[PDB]
Design a protein around this ligand. Sequence first.
Ligand SMILES: O=c1ccn([C@H]2C[C@H](O)[C@@H](COP(=O)(O)NP(=O)(O)OP(=O)(O)O)O2)c(=O)[nH]1
Ligand SMILES: [Cl-]
Ligand SMILES: [Cl-]
Ligand SMILES: [Cl-]
Ligand SMILES: [Cl-]
Ligand SMILES: [Mn+2]
Ligand SMILES: [Mn+2]
Ligand SMILES: [Mn+2]
Ligand SMILES: [Mn+2]
Ligand SMILES: [Mn+2]
Ligand code: NA
Ligand code: NA
Length: 326
Amino acid sequence: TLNGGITDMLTELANFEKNVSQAIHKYNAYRKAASVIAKYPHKIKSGAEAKKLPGVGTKIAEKIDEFLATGKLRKLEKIRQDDTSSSINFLTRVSGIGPSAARKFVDEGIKTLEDLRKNEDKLNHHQRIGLKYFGDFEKRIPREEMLQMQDIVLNEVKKVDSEYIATVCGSFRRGAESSGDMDVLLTHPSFTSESTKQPKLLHQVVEQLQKVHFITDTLSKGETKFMGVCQLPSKNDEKEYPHRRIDIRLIPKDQYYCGVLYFTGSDIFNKNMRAHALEKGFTINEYTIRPLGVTGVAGEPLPVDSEKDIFDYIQWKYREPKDRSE
DNA sequence: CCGACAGCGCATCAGC
DNA sequence: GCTGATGCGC
DNA sequence: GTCGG
Ligand SMILES: O=c1ccn([C@H]2C[C@H](O)[C@@H](COP(=O)(O)NP(=O)(O)OP(=O)(O)O)O2)c(=O)[nH]1
Ligand SMILES: [Cl-]
Ligand SMILES: [Cl-]
Ligand SMILES: [Cl-]
Ligand SMILES: [Cl-]
Ligand SMILES: [Mn+2]
Ligand SMILES: [Mn+2]
Ligand SMILES: [Mn+2]
Ligand SMILES: [Mn+2]
Ligand SMILES: [Mn+2]
Ligand code: NA
Ligand code: NA
């Protein structure tokens, strides 16, 4: 982690602007700068050297000089001493609680894990589950565990219908030795951009996973996107595995490539790639890659048959999943 | 010195 | 009931 | 907070 010190400062700053300042752009700005720095193959010796990287400006340049000069950043040392900011930051760590709900709870006197446990009646379903699994969701998932999970999801999928195609994406597909959660991309021949022949496609898949006790809870659930919890099965008498977050997204079969490009990420990567697309005159989403008319309006979907094809349309050398971790 | 910053599914609410 | 703005998340 | 124009 050549510049682990600096990227942490930045990430902390991004989290602050997002959770406490509710300044989403500043948030993204720091994330981007932290991303470009993380891949910079040199140990940064100064804020000037860093400012040469696209994304780092005069403000981050100074913060970096200050950090390198003392190993600390005053603005952050203070933020850490502000109870309100500490509470808001902490509450946002619970799935379902955003900057808004956090600042609210703080106002109503709720600002500790304990305060939340006694006011479960003031949380919506999602916030309740997030609170319930707070601890577990903090633990990372070892790849070896992701592999055990993949077999269970894929095999349980096939058992509902041998025509489903379940693909694990997210950081898992990017090659991470550890993942924050499991992301599943699902496709079935009956669901395409031209029609939904069969209904409940996603339902039955969830239903099945719940039947075998793999899926333990639901944060949210719709026709195409499921957000819940799951747990690997444990052998006889051995300790129990941490509950884990699991996202399942059903995408039209004929749009798998745009969907798989989206779900593999990373998020910062997608951001850069989609920003670049616009620069070249295109707009990309999880379903398609359309051309941008002079008026701005997006045209019809262009033909796609691989992830690379999409990359071509924007003038970018194809980059493997493992090199998309920005 | 300005406006843009990627794109979208779900839960929830206010209003009609 | 619907529509659309908001919060929160991928 | 940063950047292209
Ligand atoms: O803001 C977002 C969030 C996610 N995504 C896409 C890309 C990301 O890789 C994918 C999965 O989302 P996760 O939040 O699961 N992140 P990821 O799997 O990359 O990392 P990890 O789960 O290990 O934190 O969803 C976006 O496009 N924008
Ligand atoms: Cl902002
Ligand atoms: Cl610090
Ligand atoms: Cl596609
Ligand atoms: Cl579309
Ligand atoms: Mn993930
Ligand atoms: Mn996820
Ligand atoms: Mn548990
Ligand atoms: Mn570009
Ligand atoms: Mn009402
Ligand atoms: Na720069
Ligand atoms: Na949260």
